[PDB]
Amino acid sequence: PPHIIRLVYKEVTTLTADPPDGIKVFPNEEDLTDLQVTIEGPEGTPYAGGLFRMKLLLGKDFPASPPKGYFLTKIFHPNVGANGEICVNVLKRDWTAELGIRHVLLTIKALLIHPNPESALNEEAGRLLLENYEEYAARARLLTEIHG
Amino acid sequence: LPPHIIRLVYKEVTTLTADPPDGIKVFPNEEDLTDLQVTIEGPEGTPYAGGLFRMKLLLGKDFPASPPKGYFLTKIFHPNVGANGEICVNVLKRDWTAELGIRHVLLTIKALLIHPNPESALNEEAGRLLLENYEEYAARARLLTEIHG
Numbered sequence: 374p375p376h377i378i379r380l381v382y383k384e385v386t387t388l389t390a391d392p393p394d395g396i397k398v399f400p401n402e403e404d405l406t407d408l409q410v411t412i413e414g415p416e417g418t419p420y421a422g423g424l425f426r427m428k429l430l431l432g433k434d435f436p437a438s439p440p441k442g443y444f445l446t447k448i449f450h451p452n453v454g455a456n457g458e459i460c461v462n463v464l465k466r467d468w469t470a471e472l473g474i475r476h477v478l479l480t481i482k483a484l485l486i487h488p489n490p491e492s493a494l495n496e497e498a499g500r501l502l503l504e505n506y507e508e509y510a511a512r513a514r515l516l517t518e519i520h521g
Numbered sequence: 522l523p524p525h526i527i528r529l530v531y532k533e534v535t536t537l538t539a540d541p542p543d544g545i546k547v548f549p550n551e552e553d554l555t556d557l558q559v560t561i562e563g564p565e566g567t568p569y570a571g572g573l574f575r576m577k578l579l580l581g582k583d584f585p586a587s588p589p590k591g592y593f594l595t596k597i598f599h600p601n602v603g604a605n606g607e608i609c610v611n612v613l614k615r616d617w618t619a620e621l622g623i624r625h626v627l628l629t630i631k632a633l634l635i636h637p638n639p640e641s642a643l644n645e646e647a648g649r650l651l652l653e654n655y656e657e658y659a660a661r662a663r664l665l666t667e668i669h670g
C-alpha cells in the first residue's frame with residue numbers, strides 16, 4: 374500500500390530529524406510495516422542504562438488505529454506481557470488518527486517512568502510496584518543489567 | 522548554595538534552557554538561580570493536549586542531595602497534583618540520586634501527565650475517576666485544560 378510507503382517516510386524522517394532523546398527507529402528494508410525501535414531506559418528508573426529493543430507493527434489501517442508493539446528486550450514491567458506485548462492505556466483510550474509514531478514511542482518511554490499497575494499484564498510486577506516498590510525495582514534492575 | 526553545586530547548576534540550566542526537551546521551556550530569573558520557571562505543553566493524545574502548563578521548580582539548600590520542590594501554577598485536574606499545585610512524583614521520591622539533573626525531573630513530570638499514578642493520589646477525586654470512569658476524568662481534565670492551559 375502506497376500510504377504505508379509515504380507514511381513510513383513521513384514518520385521515519387521526522388523521527389530522525391528532531392529525534393526524541395534516547396529513541397531510534399530502524400525501518401526493515403524487507404517490510405516497512407515492521408518498524409524496529411530502540412529506547413534508552415530513562416535515568417532515575419529501574420530501567421536506567423539499558424537499551425530496549427522493540428518493534429511496532431503498523432497495520433494496514435494505521436493511523437486509524439495505533440500499531441501493535443512488542444518489547445524484544447526482556448523486561449520486568451507491569452504493562453508488558455509474557456510474549457513481550459505492550460498494553461498502554463493512553464494509546465487504547467485517547468488515540469486519534471492525527472497521532473503517529475512519535476506519540477507512540479514517547480508514550481511508551483513515559484510508561485517506563487510511570488508504569489500503570491492497574492492495567493497490568495505482568496501481575497507480579499504490578500503488585501510489587503504498588504505494594505513493595507524496592508522489590509519491583511530490584512527485579513527490574515537485574516533484568517536491565519542482563520538484557521539491556 | 523555551595524560553590525561547586527552552583528557551577529553545575531549554571532552549566533546545566535544554560536544547556537537545558539537553550540536546548541530543552543520537546544514541549545519544555547525553562548525561564549530562570551536573574552534574581553535567583555534556585556527559582557526556575559517552567560512551561561510544559563500538554564502531550565498530544567492526553568486530556569491535557571493543547572494546554573500550556575506553568576510550574577516552578579525550587580532547588581533547596583540540600584539540592585541536589587534532596588530533590589527540588591515542584592509546583593503547578595496552572596490549575597490542573599490531575600491525580601498527583603494537590604489543591605495548591607504541589608506535585609507528588611513517585612519515581613522521584615523513590616529512585617532519586619544526586620547525579621540526576623533538572624532535565625530528568627522535568628521529563629518525569631511531563632511523563633506524569635501522560636501516565637498519572639492514581640494510587641499515590643493527592644487529588645483523590647481525579648485518581649478515583651481515572652480508575653473507575655476514565656471517560657469523565659478525561660472530560661474534567663479537558664475542561665480545565667481549555668480554561669487554564
Ligand code: NA
Pocket residue numbers: 487488489490636637638639
Ligand atoms: Na502511571
